Amino acid sequence: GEYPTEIPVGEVRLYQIADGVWSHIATQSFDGAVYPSNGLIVRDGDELLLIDTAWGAKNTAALLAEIEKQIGLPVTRAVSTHFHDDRVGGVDVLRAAGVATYASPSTRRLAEVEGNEIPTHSLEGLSSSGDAVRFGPVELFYPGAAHSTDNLVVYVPSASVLYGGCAIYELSRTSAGNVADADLAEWPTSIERIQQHYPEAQFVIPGHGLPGGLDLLKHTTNVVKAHTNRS
Ligand SMILES: O=C(O)[C@H]1CCCCN1C(=O)[C@@H](CS)Cc1ccccc1
Ligand SMILES: [Zn+2]
Ligand SMILES: [Zn+2]
Ligand SMILES: [Zn+2]
Ligand SMILES: [Zn+2]
């Protein structure tokens, strides 16, 4: 029961999941309510891989300061898992600090169209549903369209940690979130692909809220199908 929930906006908290694996947790206010957001940090030798910004430039500056204070290793690369602002908002801060920023070509194009910040580098090998590539200490996986058409998930083999980003919902969320960019028809099949490729996952991190087990995948499918049938 130690995962942070406790976090004023502008602040960022780190949570150690395993040796060399942390999540980062930040908050943002939207329509008068406060939402948490998760990302991932993975050690690779004496450097760090960052997965996703902390949802905004100010939060992302605080994230880098937090990392410097608590871990003290340099973030040398970062990956954004889809084109929304809680994933790419802060890429310019990362870039100014010397972090090499990455995303899939689809994510970079969608970010551009949205007027969002655009990661510098393009990830190859992730164009088709079911594609996976090794990227430093993690595997990147494109499960197919779900929360967005471009969304990636991240697996840490040394720790059996599956980071689902916003394609996976926390258990406390029982109604669909922002699905304006989603492929509702394909989302359960994409979740099916995650389960098929990472059935040994022990720790599953949603894009927002509390980690759990692989039960978060069927929970998300249930919420998405209920939203599909809404009326
Ligand atoms: O996915 C979701 O569950 C919904 C609802 C729960 C929190 C996050 N959330 C959001 O929308 C975030 C990041 S995805 C804000 C956003 C703004 C503009 C465009 C996309 C997203
Ligand atoms: Zn999103
Ligand atoms: Zn570069
Ligand atoms: Zn999100
Ligand atoms: Zn449920």
Side-chain angles (χ1 to χ4, degrees):
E2 65 278 325
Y3 201 80
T5 59
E6 295 200 321
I7 308 177
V9 184
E11 289 196 74
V12 176
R13 301 308 179 232
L14 306 181
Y15 178 87
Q16 186 148 20
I17 300 159
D19 184 38
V21 187
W22 304 256
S23 65
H24 62 84
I25 308 90
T27 49
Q28 200 49 272
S29 67
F30 166 81
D31 281 336
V34 181
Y35 295 92
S37 191
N38 299 314
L40 203 67
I41 303 159
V42 188
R43 182 172 184 175
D44 186 8
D46 288 336
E47 309 169 7
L48 301 176
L49 174 64
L50 177 67
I51 310 293
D52 290 327
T53 66
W55 198 352
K58 178 180 181 60
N59 281 2
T60 298
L63 167 65
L64 295 181
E66 196 57 25
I67 292 177
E68 207 179 22
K69 179 188 174 187
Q70 306 289 336
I71 304 175
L73 297 173
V75 181
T76 54
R77 291 185 292 180
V79 174
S80 294
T81 57
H82 71 277
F83 73 97
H84 287 158
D85 196 51
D86 60 328
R87 313 288 136 189
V88 299
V91 152
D92 287 356
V93 162
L94 298 180
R95 181 151 51 216
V99 177
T101 55
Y102 289 73
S104 76
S106 179
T107 293
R108 293 179 70 259
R109 178 184 299 116
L110 287 161
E112 203 202 326
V113 168
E114 201 67 19
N116 292 346
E117 298 156 69
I118 304 161
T120 290
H121 287 275
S122 293
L123 294 164
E124 293 318 327
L126 292 166
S127 56
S128 293
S129 305
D131 282 346
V133 303
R134 190 75 182 220
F135 196 81
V138 307
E139 189 165 67
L140 308 177
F141 182 66
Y142 175 51
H147 161 90
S148 62
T149 60
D150 60 319
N151 48 203
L152 303 180
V153 303
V154 179
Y155 187 68
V156 190
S158 69
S160 306
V161 170
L162 179 65
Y163 173 79
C166 310
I168 301 305
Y169 286 179
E170 74 169 321
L171 297 177
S172 299
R173 169 166 287 284
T174 59
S175 59
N178 168 25
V179 299
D181 293 314
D183 190 326
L184 294 170
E186 280 308 315
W187 195 335
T189 300
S190 302
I191 286 178
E192 285 198 320
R193 292 198 187 86
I194 300 171
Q195 167 69 48
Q196 171 65 226
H197 283 79
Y198 303 106
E200 76 274 28
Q202 298 294 309
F203 197 88
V204 178
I205 303 167
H208 306 269
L210 295 187
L214 278 167
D215 47 295
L216 269 61
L217 275 62
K218 277 196 200 175
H219 165 71
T220 303
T221 293
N222 289 341
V223 175
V224 168
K225 286 181 172 198
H227 178 81
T228 293
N229 290 347
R230 72 197 180 284
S231 44

